[PDB]
Amino acid sequence: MTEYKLVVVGADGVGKSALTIQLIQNHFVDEYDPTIEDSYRKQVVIDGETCLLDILDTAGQEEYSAMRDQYMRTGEGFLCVFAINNTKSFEDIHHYREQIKRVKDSEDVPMVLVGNKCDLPSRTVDTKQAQDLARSYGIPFIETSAKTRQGVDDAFYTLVREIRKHK
Numbered sequence: 001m002t003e004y005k006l007v008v009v010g011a012d013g014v015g016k017s018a019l020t021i022q023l024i025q026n027h028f029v030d031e032y033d034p035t036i037e038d039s040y041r042k043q044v045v046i047d048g049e050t051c052l053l054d055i056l057d058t059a060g061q062e063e064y065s066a067m068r069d070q071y072m073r074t075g076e077g078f079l080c081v082f083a084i085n086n087t088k089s090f091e092d093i094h095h096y097r098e099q100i101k102r103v104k105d106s107e108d109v110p111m112v113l114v115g116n117k118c119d120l121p122s123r124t125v126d127t128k129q130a131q132d133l134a135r136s137y138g139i140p141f142i143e144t145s146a147k148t149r150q151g152v153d154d155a156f157y158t159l160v161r162e163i164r165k166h167k
């Protein structure tokens with residue numbers, strides 16, 4: 001059975017854990033419990049292929065920035081999450097992508113840009129600006145909501161397809 005090592009990254013508060021818990025448990029976490037590092041191994045069917053998703057839910061707190069090198073070396077694809085109502089989280093995406101490229105020593109790393117919290121009306125990052133950033137990276141861009149489940153399945157499955165298509 002093929003395994004896909006997925007890593008969810010992004011600034012503190014963007015909804016990394018809420019996206020992961022919505023994907024696996026089908027419910028929305030309203031609480032904010034900062035993550036250190038959690039892992040989930042889930043069997044799923046994607047495009048008729050039974051596979052194992054090994055998902056790492058990482059810390060956004062800049063205090064745990066030393067743990068990044070290890071998960072960037074082992075991770076096969078990265079879900080780079082920003083929140084559409086947090087401009088700092090959108091600007092921080094560049095730092096996550098640069099560090100991934102440096103650790104992998106490659107500009108072609110499976111990655112998906114995710115604009116989370118699309119259910120909120122307090123938007124500060126234009127969809128067009130995020131689309132333009134993802135185009136400049138050569139990667140897919142998907143808007144998601146861990147509350148409504150909009151784009152959640154699409155974001156994770158698109159990342160698996162990027163790992164499967166880089167292969």
Ligand SMILES: Nc1nc2c(ncn2[C@@H]2O[C@H](COP(=O)(O)OP(=O)(O)CP(=O)(O)O)[C@@H](O)[C@H]2O)c(=O)[nH]1
Nearest residue numbers: 012013014015016017018030034035060117145146
């Ligand atoms: N409205 C809305 N709120 C969300 C969404 N995703 C997460 N949140 C909220 O944002 C807060 C932080 O979510 P959380 O999943 O812990 O974010 P995180 O990126 O994992 C935080 P850390 O980096 O410290 O692990 C929570 O209150 C959660 O309910 C979303 O899509 N929509």
Ligand SMILES: [Mg+2]
Nearest residue numbers: 016017034035
């Ligand atoms: Mg978290």
